[PDB]
Amino acid sequence: GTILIDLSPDDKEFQSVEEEMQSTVREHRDGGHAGGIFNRYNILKIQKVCNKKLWERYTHRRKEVSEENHNHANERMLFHGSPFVNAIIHKGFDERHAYIGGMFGAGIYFAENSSKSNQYVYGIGGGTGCPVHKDRSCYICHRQLLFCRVTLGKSFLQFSAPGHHSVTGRPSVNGLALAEYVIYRGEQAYPEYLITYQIMRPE
Amino acid sequence: GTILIDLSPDDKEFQSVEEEMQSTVREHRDGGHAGGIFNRYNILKIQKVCNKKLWERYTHRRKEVSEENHNHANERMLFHGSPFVNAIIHKGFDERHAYIGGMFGAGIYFAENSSKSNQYVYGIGGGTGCPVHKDRSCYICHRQLLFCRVTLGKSFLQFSAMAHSPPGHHSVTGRPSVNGLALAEYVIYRGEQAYPEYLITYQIMRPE
Numbered sequence A: 001g002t003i004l005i006d007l008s009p010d011d012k013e014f015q016s017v018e019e020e021m022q023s024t025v026r027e028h029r030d031g032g033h034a035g036g037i038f039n040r041y042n043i044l045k046i047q048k049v050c051n052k053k054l055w056e057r058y059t060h061r062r063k064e065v066s067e068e069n070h071n072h073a074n075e076r077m078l079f080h081g082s083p084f085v086n087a088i089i090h091k092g093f094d095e096r097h098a099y100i101g102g103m104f105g106a107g108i109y110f111a112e113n114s115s116k117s118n119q120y121v122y123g124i125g126g127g128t129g130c131p132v133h134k135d136r137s138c139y140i141c142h143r144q145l146l147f148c149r150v151t152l153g154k155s156f157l158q159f160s161a162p163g164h165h166s167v168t169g170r171p172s173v174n175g176l177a178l179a180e181y182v183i184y185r186g187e188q189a190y191p192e193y194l195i196t197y198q199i200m201r202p203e
Numbered sequence B: 001g002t003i004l005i006d007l008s009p010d011d012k013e014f015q016s017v018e019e020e021m022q023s024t025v026r027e028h029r030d031g032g033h034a035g036g037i038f039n040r041y042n043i044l045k046i047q048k049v050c051n052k053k054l055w056e057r058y059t060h061r062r063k064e065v066s067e068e069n070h071n072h073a074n075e076r077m078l079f080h081g082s083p084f085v086n087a088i089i090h091k092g093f094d095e096r097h098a099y100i101g102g103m104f105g106a107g108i109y110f111a112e113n114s115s116k117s118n119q120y121v122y123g124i125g126g127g128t129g130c131p132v133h134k135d136r137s138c139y140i141c142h143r144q145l146l147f148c149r150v151t152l153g154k155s156f157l158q159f160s161a162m163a164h165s166p167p168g169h170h171s172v173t174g175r176p177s178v179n180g181l182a183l184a185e186y187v188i189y190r191g192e193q194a195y196p197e198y199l200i201t202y203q204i205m206r207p208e
């Protein structure tokens, strides 16, 4: 089903996805333990992820949700990082992609902060870091994030210090952090862009 | 200078800290008024607090106390709840964090019962409860406690009915004399005598 199409760096679509990726980088309270130390990325590639059957699975679920929420899908574009980005662009999101111990309750997690999703590229907590150097802050190995179309519908607003289709994990302390979100059905997200980058060591 | 490092639920360090939380829940004489009604917590996250500077400030004070007490720091792990948990992990403890009207005197209070420290998450007596529902028994909103390394030194034993250190003492141990299920509470006078080692984020859990 799945084909990847390169966006040229000169394409406006490449440029708006890049800018979203760069501009939603923030400092993390772990000092970069999980995701490494950086303020921006070297963007290597941006690919549109085209799969007709996964896309129809998304629009169909989107429909159902809009119709349970006064015609409002409450659709966002959000980041997702995972060691399973390959399975996801081929087979779609599903239960095995759910973060069981997630801070806002078991489900599939998405972030407004690209740098938050970056923390999960090598697994929970950055796991053991890159597979080549075991370096969570590796500046050499290439990473991927997905920039995804997510249907939130009626979102349960949860604060950190049934009748809902998602949870919004609002930040409270950390007046720097953006929102995180959780869906319970894989069909409510579609992995539209695949972004290959390095994190860049600061000056 | 503070960094917070997540511990994994599979880490035995995570597990020891959680069990310390859970196993020290008790009934309170307020029926849950200040801290809410619960028998256990839902632990969302445990982070180690790393800050090289506050840590040296802690150990320098501990050595002093230890020496003044015949080489016994009398160091414990104790809970602390406070609306200012975020400041404390950055700045450490100082006299801003002293409960002036505390039962065992003006100073900085620590509990062996996690549920006792939980009564202070939203202020003394639980203030007006969570910032969003104004509900002191809120089962939805996230709370944080600190589990801290605390130097007692020579501790003055004070019995209860339930500023400046006492004469040549480095702390007070407050021991409830009526209720023997209640565990001890402690007071220090110097912020440097405590280090916030873990930050635990949790919800109290509704019982059935």
Ligand SMILES: C[C@]1(c2ccc(-c3nc4ccccc4c(=O)[nH]3)cc2)NC(=O)NC1=O
Pocket: A079, A080, A081, A082, A083, A084, A096, A097, A098, A099, A100, A109, A110, A111, A116, A117, A118, A120, A123, A124, A180
């Ligand atoms: C590796 C895996 C997992 C866990 C969490 C995340 C993840 N968690 C997040 C939490 C907050 C914000 C973003 C993310 C995010 O982009 N990704 C990704 C994959 N853990 C798991 O049980 N299934 C997964 O797919």
Ligand SMILES: C[C@]1(c2ccc(-c3nc4ccccc4c(=O)[nH]3)cc2)NC(=O)NC1=O
Pocket: B079, B080, B081, B082, B083, B084, B096, B097, B098, B099, B100, B109, B110, B111, B116, B117, B118, B120, B123, B124, B185, B186
């Ligand atoms: C809010 C504040 C305060 C007062 C009491 C407590 C507190 N009091 C306790 C008393 C007994 C046992 C534990 C605690 C405990 O964990 N925390 C914490 C903060 N009052 C204050 O003057 N400074 C504070 O930080």
Ligand SMILES: [Zn+2]
Pocket: A130, A131, A132, A133, A134, A135, A138, A139, A140, A141
């Ligand atoms: Zn590497």
Ligand SMILES: [Zn+2]
Pocket: B130, B131, B132, B133, B134, B135, B138, B139, B140, B141
């Ligand atoms: Zn609340």
